[PDB]
Amino acid sequence: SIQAEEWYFGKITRRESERLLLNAENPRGTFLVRESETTKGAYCLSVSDFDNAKGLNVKHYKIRKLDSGGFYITSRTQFNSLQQLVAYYSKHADGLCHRLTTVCPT
Numbered sequence: 001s002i003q004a005e006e007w008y009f010g011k012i013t014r015r016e017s018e019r020l021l022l023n024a025e026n027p028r029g030t031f032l033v034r035e036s037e038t039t040k041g042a043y044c045l046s047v048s049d050f051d052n053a054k055g056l057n058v059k060h061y062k063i064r065k066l067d068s069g070g071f072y073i074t075s076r077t078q079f080n081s082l083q084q085l086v087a088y089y090s091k092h093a094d095g096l097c098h099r100l101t102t103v104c105p106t
């Protein structure tokens with residue numbers, strides 16, 4: 001159950017995800033998964049990042065879920081569950097601004 005996941009914030013807004021992620025104490029990769037405001041059946045993986053050009057900032061990636069069961073950000077790299085996807089991206093940055101590190105604090 002995704003709702004059982006501590007990183008699953010469910011129905012929170014994009015502005016709220018940014019308010020929570022834009023905390024100076026959050027290292028790069030602080031993240032949360034929420035429902036997308038625009039795409040029904042898709043979620044957003046909101047991630048914090050930091051660099052000297054943009055300072056602390058947030059990126060939002062769309063996570064799709066197929067009826068065929070896979071979950072993915074890029075269709076070329078799919079997972080049997082949202083949990084597996086989070087685990088994979090916690091170990092590989094790939095196209096993300098940073099690999100997922102810890103759950104965002106409220």
Ligand SMILES: *C(=O)c1cc(C[C@H](NC(C)=O)C(=O)N[C@H]2CCCCN(Cc3ccc(-c4ccccc4)cc3)C2=O)ccc1OP(=O)(O)O
Pocket residue numbers: 013014035036037038039042043044045059060061062063073074093094095096
């Ligand atoms: C959630 O569904 C959500 C997310 C988005 C996508 C956002 N849009 C906005 C308005 O911020 C977006 O454009 N994000 C960027 C993130 C940075 C990288 C550029 N990009 C395309 C891209 C390229 C490569 C990969 C990738 C990742 C891992 C491995 C391989 C490749 C991912 C993404 C983006 O997509 C829009 C809306 C939205 O719902 P809301 O509730 O409105 O926020």
